[PDB]
Every structure is written in C-alpha cells, then in structure tokens.
Amino acid sequence: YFKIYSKHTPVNLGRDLPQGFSALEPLVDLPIGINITRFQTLLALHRSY
C-alpha cells in the first residue's frame, strides 16, 4: 500500500524552504506490486511558459 500524506501550508510567503514545524495526515492506499525502480512526472505542456 502507498499512503499520500499531505499538508497544505499557505503560511509560506515565497521564501525557499523556511523554518517551522508541521505534520501530514494519511489519505488513501492502493496495492499494485512491482519493482518500481524509477519515477517521473509529466507536465501539462500544452501551456508552456
């Protein structure tokens, strides 16, 4: 299973990785089962800038 922990944080002002503390909560799980070995993210390239 893989759990997507996420904490939406709007306190940030725009600085690169500021200091603080937070915590993240589980959302959902789903089994697949594979030698993943790689990862990538595609981009919505139809609007490029």
Binding site: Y1, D29, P31, G33
Partner: protein, 49 residues
C-alpha cells in the same frame, strides 16, 4: 443453434436461468465484505468491549 423456446412445452425446454458467483482471494484489501450489525452500548458497567 437457436434454442427454440416453447412456452407450451413441459419441463426441460422451459427457460431456466443459472447464475454463477466467483470468489477469489486476490491480494486486494477488503472490498466485498459483510459484517454484523453493531449491538447497543452500555455505560458504567464492567463488560467485554
């Protein structure tokens, strides 16, 4: 081959419907499960909870 249904015919050739139910223990979370209904709740009484 066409079945050739006969409404006036007796047993055998009359329409009989058979349905199947396939159960498998795949590596998946609890998906089709029927539990028991929860009984009432008691307070200030030493019971098994």
């Amino acid at each position: 081959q066409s079945y050739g249904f006969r409404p006036t015919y007796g047993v055998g050739h009359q329409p009989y419907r058979v349905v199947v139910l396939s159960f498998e223990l795949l590596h998946a979370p609890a998906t089709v499960c029927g539990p028991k209904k929860s009984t009432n709740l008691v307070k200030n009484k030493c019971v098994n909870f």
